[PDB]
Amino acid sequence: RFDCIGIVGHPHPAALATHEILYHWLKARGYAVMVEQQIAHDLNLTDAITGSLADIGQKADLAVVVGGDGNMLGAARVLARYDIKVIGVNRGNLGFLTDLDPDNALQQLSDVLEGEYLSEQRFLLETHVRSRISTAINEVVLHPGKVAHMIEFEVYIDDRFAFSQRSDGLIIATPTGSTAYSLSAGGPILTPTLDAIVLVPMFPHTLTARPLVISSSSTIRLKFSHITSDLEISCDSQIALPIQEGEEVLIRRSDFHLNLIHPKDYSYFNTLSTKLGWSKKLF
Amino acid sequence: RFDCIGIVGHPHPAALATHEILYHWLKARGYAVMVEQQIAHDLNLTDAITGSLADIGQKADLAVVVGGDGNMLGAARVLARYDIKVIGVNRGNLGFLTDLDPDNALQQLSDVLEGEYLSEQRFLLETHVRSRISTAINEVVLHPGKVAHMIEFEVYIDDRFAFSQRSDGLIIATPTGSTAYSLSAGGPILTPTLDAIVLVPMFPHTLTARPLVISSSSTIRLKFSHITSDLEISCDSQIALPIQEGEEVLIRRSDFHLNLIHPKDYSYFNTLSTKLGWSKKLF
């Protein structure tokens, strides 16, 4: 059972009803509820217990993230610092982190609160530049400032030299990231709980480049020759950290884990197929 | 240390010198040697202790597989049934299972016998059709008899329906297989010790198909609609097992493990780069 439920998200104005309905529903069912500060203000919830995201993350037992997969992205990176259960309500179709359909959210959530849920752990990525420490649920991306600019770098795996590369950047994706930016760059789908990390080059210079899937207990090091162009590292499409001259990037499995939960009737492959347009049962 | 070394392989006639040199060298260094029956005959080794591959596999402590990666393929599938160390001498360049270069084989092997080796385990695939039980080091491939013939099937992962497919077949590859047939079908490279298995469709009917990387502790089930065309399963390009009507294919991690060893100066990424034509150290 969950004593304290938190409502997270940042609502255009018609997404507000969802927050409003959920807050009253959760409340009338006897739960203590923490809403995010912005939503309390937006809905004028004078009685509501509010808090920042970190607050909810420390004091709530479950966070219902309302919104899309992108909303979930910033929310998840924080809530993963904590031992809180996270579940999401999407808007319309299923997403890879949001599996409560709005048409049936309450009913499904009602069963989840009863304790009918599938609990799993998504791992995050950690990045140092050398120390700035940033994290990512989907991917870390190395890339220059100019769009079509070829860079050179060497890739070390577990302290040992793996390979050089001439290209426009490298994408490093978690299983959760594999269906994201990495997919659109020609990378493979990894199953969500897999202990793996995929490296996908962007516009490689040689024709023999291919997505490399490595163990998630592996360490990655980026070394660079010289800097007259601006190297940058992005984590989940948040603000690029500049990479200075003589600096290296260190990417590894983070110690923070997203404690996702799902309703019993959830399955990954069904989410995947509906998302990608795969064939359903044929006979 | 290794008491009993076995020489395995099937030698065109100039590959015979290698077998001949190795057998005398191993012998003069004090080892008990088991040669394969064919090679004993081919070299006229009247004193040699011989045996089938299974024999060497049960009685030798190390098998030196002379030849190419293809020679290693049949040899490995058998030697993996046993707790024997396996190392290979290639012919020319490095391969993914053969890392002793002929130009330096003895010297490197001499250090290996001293106990200077990196030991690792490649897992195999197991297939039932329902029961015929066959195994594979590289991949299992579902495909019809006619070359360009579209088939329909459903794929179950861990007893649950994953997705349907219309295509010309499915490749299911181990990490060791990932650099093989699967690669040429547009699949990704998996790192050799990774607990993963990759599914790669062949000529899919829908544009949204993509290599799927799943956990190696996962089970796979192929179900089919009807049979007027001849379905077949191939394991490591050996003779196709026919798949009758009402029959399903079951593919899972086999319990047999290839106990490969490597010399200290071996590294996967160096083998990979030389094989694929990747850039070496740039600075």
Q: Experimental method for this entry?
A: X-ray
Nearest to A211 by CA among A237, A178, A239: A178
Is B184 labelled a binding residue? yes
For strand B196-201 and strand B212-215, is the pairing parallel, antiparallel, or unpaired? Answer: antiparallel
Q: Which residue of A has its CA nearest to B166?
A: A279
First to last CA, chain A: 40
CA B11 vs CA B8, B17, B53, B71: distances in Å = 10, 9, 15, 10
- CATH 2.60.200.30 given to domain A124-255: yes
Question: How far apart are alpha carbons B50 and B7 in whole angstroms?
Answer: 9
Tokens read off for A283 = 């006979």
Q: Which residues does A164 contact at the CB level (< 8 Å), separation at least 6?
A: A152, A153, A154, A155, B278, B279, B280, B281, B282
Question: How far apart are alpha carbons B81 and B94 in whole angstroms?
Answer: 25
> Catalytic residue positions of B?
69
B275: helix, coil or strand?
helix
B125 C-beta neighbours (distance < 10 Å), count: 26
Question: How far apart are alpha carbons A117 and A146 in whole angstroms?
Answer: 46
Is B107 labelled a binding residue? no
Q: Helices in B123-250 by DSSP H: which ranges? A: 181-184
Nearest to B163 among A213, A269, A283 (CB): A269
B225 C-beta neighbours (distance < 10 Å), count: 12
Q: What is the CATH number of domain A1-123+256-283?
A: 3.40.50.10330
Q: What is the DSSP string of A168-209?
A: S-EEEE-TTGGGTHHHHTTPPEEPTT-SEEEEEESS-SSTT-
Tokens read off for A140 = 């870390």
**Contact across the interface for B157 and A269, Cβ inside 8 Å:** yes
Question: How far apart are alpha carbons A80 and A134 in whole angstroms?
Answer: 13
Where in chain B do CATH 3.40.50.10330 domains reside?
A: 1-123+256-283
Question: How far apart are alpha carbons A104 and A91 in whole angstroms?
Answer: 11
Degrees, nearest 5: CA angle B28-B34-B37: 125
Shortest CA gap B25–chain A (Å): 34
Residue type, A94: L
Is A176 labelled a binding residue? yes
Nearest to B241 by CA among B214, B222, B213: B222
Contact A275/B at CB under 8 A: no
Q: Which residues pair with B88 in a beta bridge?
A: B65
Q: Which of A170, A178, A189 to mutate to test binding with chain B, by most B CBs within 10 Å of its CB?
A: A189
Q: Could you tell me the sign of the dihedral formed by the alpha carbons of A25, A28, A30, A36, in that order?
A: positive
**Contact across the interface for B194 and A215, Cβ inside 8 Å:** yes
Contact B28/A at CB under 8 A: no
Nearest to B194 among A188, A213, A281 (CB): A213
Where in chain A do CATH 2.60.200.30 domains reside?
A: 124-255
B140: helix, coil or strand?
strand
Helix (H) or strand (E) run with residue B117 in it: strand B117-129
Residue type, B65: V
**Contact across the interface for B278 and A208, Cβ inside 8 Å:** yes
Nearest to B197 by CA among B181, B180, B184, B211: B211
Helix (H) or strand (E) run with residue B27 in it: helix B16-28
Question: How far apart are alpha carbons B2 and B62 in whole angstroms?
Answer: 7
> Catalytic residue positions of A?
69
Using CB atoms within 10 A of its CB, is residue B209 exposed (0-12), middle (13-18) or buried (19+)? buried
**Residue found under tokens 């020759």:** A225
Q: Which residues does A222 contact at the CB level (< 8 Å), separation at least 6?
A: A142, A153, A154, A155, A156, A170, A248, A249, A250, A251
The answer to whether B77 and B237 have CB atoms below 8 angstroms apart is no
For strand A62-66 and strand A4-8, is the pairing parallel, antiparallel, or unpaired? Answer: parallel
**Contact across the interface for A279 and B206, Cβ inside 8 Å:** yes
B39: helix, coil or strand?
helix
- Torsions phi, psi of B8, nearest 5? -125, 155
B208: helix, coil or strand?
coil
CA A197 vs CA A251, B17, B209: distances in Å = 11, 44, 20
Nearest to A261 by CA among A12, A58, A61, A70: A61
The answer to whether A37 and A54 have CB atoms below 8 angstroms apart is no
**Contact across the interface for A283 and B166, Cβ inside 8 Å:** no
Nearest to B106 by CA among B21, B40, B48: B21
Is B149 labelled a binding residue? yes
What is chain A's alpha carbon radius of gyration, rounded to the nearest angstrom?
21
Tokens read off for B143 = 């495909």
